[PDB]
Design an enzyme around this catalytic site. Structure first.
Site, PDB file in Angstrom:
ATOM      1  N   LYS A  57       0.782  -1.238  -0.077  1.00 55.98           N
ATOM      2  CA  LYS A  57      -0.196  -0.103  -0.120  1.00 55.98           C
ATOM      3  C   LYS A  57       0.736   1.195  -0.003  1.00 55.98           C
ATOM      4  O   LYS A  57       0.505   2.098  -0.784  1.00 55.98           O
ATOM      5  CB  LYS A  57      -1.026   0.132   1.130  1.00 55.98           C
ATOM      6  CG  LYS A  57      -2.089  -0.978   0.942  1.00 55.98           C
ATOM      7  CD  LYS A  57      -3.114  -0.983   1.948  1.00 55.98           C
ATOM      8  CE  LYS A  57      -2.723  -0.958   3.469  1.00 55.98           C
ATOM      9  NZ  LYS A  57      -2.021  -1.971   4.035  1.00 55.98           N
ATOM     10  N   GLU A  62       0.100   6.068  10.752  1.00 58.45           N
ATOM     11  CA  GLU A  62       1.410   5.639   9.976  1.00 58.45           C
ATOM     12  C   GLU A  62       2.635   5.495  10.940  1.00 58.45           C
ATOM     13  O   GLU A  62       2.724   5.928  12.108  1.00 58.45           O
ATOM     14  CB  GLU A  62       1.512   7.103   8.903  1.00 58.45           C
ATOM     15  CG  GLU A  62       2.684   6.811   8.113  1.00 58.45           C
ATOM     16  CD  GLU A  62       3.297   8.217   7.818  1.00 58.45           C
ATOM     17  OE1 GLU A  62       3.544   8.927   8.663  1.00 58.45           O
ATOM     18  OE2 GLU A  62       3.521   8.499   6.522  1.00 58.45           O
ATOM     19  N   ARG A  63       3.596   4.820  10.410  1.00 60.18           N
ATOM     20  CA  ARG A  63       4.960   4.705  11.127  1.00 60.18           C
ATOM     21  C   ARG A  63       5.794   6.109  11.338  1.00 60.18           C
ATOM     22  O   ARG A  63       5.907   6.542  10.011  1.00 60.18           O
ATOM     23  CB  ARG A  63       5.713   3.281  10.705  1.00 60.18           C
ATOM     24  CG  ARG A  63       5.123   2.136  10.591  1.00 60.18           C
ATOM     25  CD  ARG A  63       5.938   1.100   9.768  1.00 60.18           C
ATOM     26  NE  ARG A  63       5.362  -0.259   9.737  1.00 60.18           N
ATOM     27  CZ  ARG A  63       4.257  -0.323   8.913  1.00 60.18           C
ATOM     28  NH1 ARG A  63       3.963   0.399   7.718  1.00 60.18           N
ATOM     29  NH2 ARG A  63       3.410  -1.490   8.803  1.00 60.18           N
TER      30      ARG A  63
HETATM   31  N1  LIG Z   1       6.986  -2.841  -5.574  1.00 61.51           N
HETATM   32  C1  LIG Z   1       7.642  -3.623  -4.571  1.00 61.51           C
HETATM   33  N2  LIG Z   1       9.005  -4.009  -5.106  1.00 61.51           N
HETATM   34  C2  LIG Z   1       9.731  -4.496  -3.990  1.00 61.51           C
HETATM   35  N3  LIG Z   1       9.231  -5.074  -2.839  1.00 61.51           N
HETATM   36  C3  LIG Z   1       8.245  -4.487  -2.443  1.00 61.51           C
HETATM   37  C4  LIG Z   1       7.148  -3.838  -3.292  1.00 61.51           C
HETATM   38  N4  LIG Z   1       5.983  -3.355  -2.642  1.00 61.51           N
HETATM   39  C5  LIG Z   1       6.425  -4.125  -1.481  1.00 61.51           C
HETATM   40  N5  LIG Z   1       7.613  -4.665  -1.448  1.00 61.51           N
HETATM   41  C6  LIG Z   1       8.123  -5.276  -0.147  1.00 61.51           C
HETATM   42  O1  LIG Z   1       7.340  -4.966   0.951  1.00 61.51           O
HETATM   43  C7  LIG Z   1       7.401  -3.880   1.472  1.00 61.51           C
HETATM   44  C8  LIG Z   1       6.499  -2.710   1.294  1.00 61.51           C
HETATM   45  O2  LIG Z   1       5.468  -3.060   1.913  1.00 61.51           O
HETATM   46  P1  LIG Z   1       4.600  -1.701   2.430  1.00 61.51           P
HETATM   47  O3  LIG Z   1       4.498  -0.914   1.035  1.00 61.51           O
HETATM   48  O4  LIG Z   1       4.869  -1.122   3.593  1.00 61.51           O
HETATM   49  O5  LIG Z   1       3.156  -2.342   2.699  1.00 61.51           O
HETATM   50  P2  LIG Z   1       1.667  -1.993   3.428  1.00 61.51           P
HETATM   51  O6  LIG Z   1       1.641  -0.662   3.557  1.00 61.51           O
HETATM   52  O7  LIG Z   1       0.638  -2.737   2.559  1.00 61.51           O
HETATM   53  O8  LIG Z   1       1.941  -2.574   4.890  1.00 61.51           O
HETATM   54  C9  LIG Z   1       8.831  -3.441   1.261  1.00 61.51           C
HETATM   55  O9  LIG Z   1       9.517  -3.338   2.113  1.00 61.51           O
HETATM   56  C10 LIG Z   1       9.511  -4.910   0.214  1.00 61.51           C
HETATM   57  O10 LIG Z   1      10.005  -5.672   0.931  1.00 61.51           O
HETATM   58 MG   LIG Z   2       2.261   1.191   5.421  1.00 54.29          MG
END
Ligand SMILES: Nc1ncnc2c1ncn2[C@@H]1O[C@H](COP(=O)(O)OP(=O)(O)O)[C@@H](O)[C@H]1O
Ligand SMILES: [Mg+2]
Lengths: 66, 456, 177, 109
Positions: free
Chosen positions: B153, B179-180
């Site tokens: 996301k 958020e973090r």
């Molecule tokens: N487009 C992407 N390419 C590579 N790794 C990704 C990608 N999207 C997510 N990831 C992996 O997951 C993490 C991102 O999750 P995040 O965007 O924070 O998810 P959410 O917000 O849904 O919890 C990255 O640290 C990576 O390890």
């Molecule tokens: Mg997030």
């Protein structure tokens, strides 16, 4: 109401209790309910006899849950 | 007049005022001595109001005097808010001193009337293959990034911000809700280092803050976007997680004396959501384009919170944990994602046929997967063996290297145009690449890079 | 729950006993004195102490009142204390008068005029109000400078408004609806 | 001192004692007319304590007198317990006579 009813009250021996002190009302499952701790702040520490200490968590209207 | 605190329980505080001076619903109150603000949520009766603290209560006591301000939380609005970081109360949370405001608005407001709504289908290009194909966004439309924990996301939203906000000529509001604090710091330094911080207003309410803060941060960010929309401008509104607004209401609902509903949610789940979501819209004065990230508890899309959210959005992008578990990103489900723009009259017949063609192949592959697992692949027809090979190529051609994800992959980012996406998928469906191995389509960009990758 | 809900049994008990022993005025005086005494800040505090027993709290309230409580009223005060209901005495006193008023066939009306107080005006309205309610009327006139001209009559939940401010309200809603 | 049974609900019994003689938590109490043992679980206020009966409550009534023993349930310990059968209160249930105990220990530590 009357000057008579206004009197008598000074002989009722109500006195007072310090805002920083109270008395234990009940003791159950690690929870203690206290009457009179008017100046308590949430999370503040309460001192009991024997060196036992508590932490005030419920500052309700007429009772403190520690 | 003046009130006294009578009952503190967690984040909820009761304040008793003279029966002739009872503050209004949603009115802001100030505690004497302590720096704390309370918003009236309910009038219990007998001069008492029930309120939620916009700060910590560790320093609060029974009997502290509370002051009535005569109004709801008033935050600064307009040009002075650009390039600044602020809290729920509108105070600056950056070391750049005070904000030169020329007006303050109240966070609570009515939604635009039925006669004020405006309809537009201008196609907005994102640069992502899966989205540009099955979820075409529209200028002034509402987008939702649905997904569980750890599926992309934030990453996807950052890529959009980069592929749209940076080019966007108008202003922008970014609201970090639950958020973090680390993501907020990385994004602030990113907007500052990219020189784009000058056209972005930043409002932050992270997970370390009291329920009341996380319950009103969304109304603060939206109030700033509404001031700009009402000036006749085109605005972008990005919300990090709108679920934290619902959750803050669940955390405080039971202490407010409300009986719980299904899945332990507040009985006001659909109205509290409608009151916020109906203000995030494009009227006849200006246009707010908005992207919201929607958390899905335990990956279950039938959970009351995610389920009540779909009806408020124009574009619904669904991220799948099963695709992410195969190392495929963006982890978008092309069978659960949808848009109001996926219509032949709006996008054209060629794009529409290519999108429906890709979805038909993927749905047929989903039902052949179990057959292949138990019996094996040789027990399939010649048509099915060919379809399974193409489905596996389409599933890998939807992966894309992103510029905001280079630290996670090590590979350079790519931007594919809508013309290139349609051509690459039309070719795979037609059979123009039935010789290349399925590994050649994984993490590449346009279809030419798959052809180069196959040789190596 | 509403204090009225908790005080209903006690007020009805006092009324049904008072009526059957020809004491409807003695209990009225006793309940009014008990309500007043209990509301005093010193007595309020005394009645909320964890050290005193129900009988000790009850006794203290009887000693302050003295001659004002007859034997039966003294027994009623003990019953309220035994059940831990001494914080409901003002409400019990209020509900007792309401039951008595319906019994005596009377109403305490609250007339509010625009700058006027006169016997000629009161007796001219009180006959019509008495006839309409089918009860004796105890007018409690007062002044409401807010009103341009006229009077508002409050009796129970019935509210007969004949004030010019009421005509201005009607005129205002008619234009915008 | 001596308290009065004020409430009975299944295995749980409430007993009221003078404010200067309230039994402590886990203190053992004995009903005067049946010798049934009760263990104090919590103090409710107003001199009232809540307890669990260490036997059947059938035939008990409100107003019965209760004696506080000044200690928790205490059972015999040591070599005298070997080859013997005992109940929850440390009484012998094997018909072999009294236990030759030298000392007793409370069951809460
Ligand atoms: N487009 C992407 N390419 C590579 N790794 C990704 C990608 N999207 C997510 N990831 C992996 O997951 C993490 C991102 O999750 P995040 O965007 O924070 O998810 P959410 O917000 O849904 O919890 C990255 O640290 C990576 O390890
Ligand atoms: Mg997030």
């Amino acid at each position: 109401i009357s000057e008579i009813i206004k009197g008598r009250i000074e002989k009722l021996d109500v006195a007072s209790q310090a805002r920083n002190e109270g008395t234990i009302v009940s003791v159950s499952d690690g929870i203690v309910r206290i009457y009179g701790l008017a100046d308590v702040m949430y999370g503040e520490m309460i001192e009991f006899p024997g060196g036992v200490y508590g932490m005030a968590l419920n500052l309700e209207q007429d009772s403190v849950g520690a | 007049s003046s009130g006294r605190i009578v009952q503190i329980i967690g984040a909820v505080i009761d304040v008793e005022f003279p029966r002739d001076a009872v503050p209004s619903i949603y009115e802001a109150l100030k505690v004497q001595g302590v720096e704390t603000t309370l918003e009236v949520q309910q009038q219990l009766g007998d001069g008492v109001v029930r309120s939620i603290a916009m700060g910590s209560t560790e320093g609060l006591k029974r009997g502290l005097n509370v002051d009535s301000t005569g109004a709801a939380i008033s935050v600064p609005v307009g040009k002075a808010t650009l390039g600044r970081i602020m809290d729920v109360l509108g105070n600056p949370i950056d070391e750049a001193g005070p904000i030169g405001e020329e007006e303050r608005w109240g966070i609570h407001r009515e939604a635009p009337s039925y006669a004020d709504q405006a309809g537009g289908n201008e196609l907005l290009e994102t640069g992502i293959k899966v989205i540009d194909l099955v979820c075409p966004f529209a200028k002034g439309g509402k987008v939702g990034l649905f997904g569980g924990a750890g599926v992309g996301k934030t990453v996807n939203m950052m890529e959009l911000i980069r592929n749209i906000a940076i080019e966007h000529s108008g202003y922008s509001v970014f609201a970090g809700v639950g958020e973090r604090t680390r993501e907020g710091n990385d994004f602030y330094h990113e907007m500052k280092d990219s020189n784009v911080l000058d056209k972005v207003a930043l409002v932050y309410g992270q997970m370390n803050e009291p329920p009341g803060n996380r319950l009103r941060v969304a109304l603060t960010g939206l109030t700033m976007a509404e001031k700009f929309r009402d000036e006749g401008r085109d605005v972008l509104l990005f919300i990090d997680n709108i679920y934290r607004y619902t959750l803050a209401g669940t955390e405080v609902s039971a202490l407010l004396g409300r009986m719980p509903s299904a899945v332990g949610y507040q009985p006001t789940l659909a109205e509290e959501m409608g009151v916020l979501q109906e203000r995030i819209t494009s009227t006849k004065k200006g246009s707010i384009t908005s992207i919201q990230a929607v958390y899905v508890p335990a990956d279950d899309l039938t959970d009351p919170s995610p389920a009540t959210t779909f009806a408020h959005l124009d574009a619904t992008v669904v991220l799948s944990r099963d695709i992410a578990s195969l190392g495929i990103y963006p982890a978008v489900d092309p069978l659960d994602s949808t848009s109001r723009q996926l219509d032949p009259l709006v996008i054209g017949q060629d794009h529409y046929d290519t999108a429906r063609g890709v979805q038909y192949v993927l749905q047929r592959y989903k039902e052949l997967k179990d057959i292949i697992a138990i019996l094996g692949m040789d027990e399939l027809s010649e048509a099915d063996k060919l379809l399974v090979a193409r489905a596996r190529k389409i599933q890998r051609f939807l992966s894309q290297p992103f510029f905001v994800a280079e630290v996670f992959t090590g590979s350079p980012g790519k931007y594919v145009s809508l013309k290139d996406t349609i051509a690459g998928f039309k070719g795979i469906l037609n059979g123009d690449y039935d010789h290349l191995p399925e590994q050649a389509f994984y993490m590449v960009g346009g279809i030419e890079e798959a052809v180069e990758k196959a040789k190596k | 729950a509403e204090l009225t809900t908790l005080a209903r049994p006690y007020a009805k008990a006092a009324f049904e006993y008072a009526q059957a022993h020809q004491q409807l005025a003695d209990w009225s005086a006793a309940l009014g004195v008990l309500a007043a005494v209990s509301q005093d800040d010193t007595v309020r505090q005394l009645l909320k102490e964890p050290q005193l027993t129900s009988s000790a709290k009850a006794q203290s309230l009887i000693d302050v009142c003295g001659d004002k409580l007859n034997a039966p009223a003294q027994n009623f005060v003990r019953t309220v204390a035994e059940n831990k209901r001494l914080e409901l005495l003002p409400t019990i006193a209020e509900m007792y008068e309401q039951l008595k008023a319906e019994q005596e066939k009377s109403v305490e009306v609250e007339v509010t005029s625009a700058f006027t107080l006169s016997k000629e005006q009161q007796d001219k309205l009180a006959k019509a109000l008495s006839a309409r309610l089918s009860r004796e009327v105890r007018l409690h006139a007062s002044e409401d400078a807010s009103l341009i001209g006229g009077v508002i009559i409050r009796a129970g939940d019935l509210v007969i408004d004949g004030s010019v401010r009421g005509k201005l309200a009607k005129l205002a809603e008619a234009l915008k609806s």
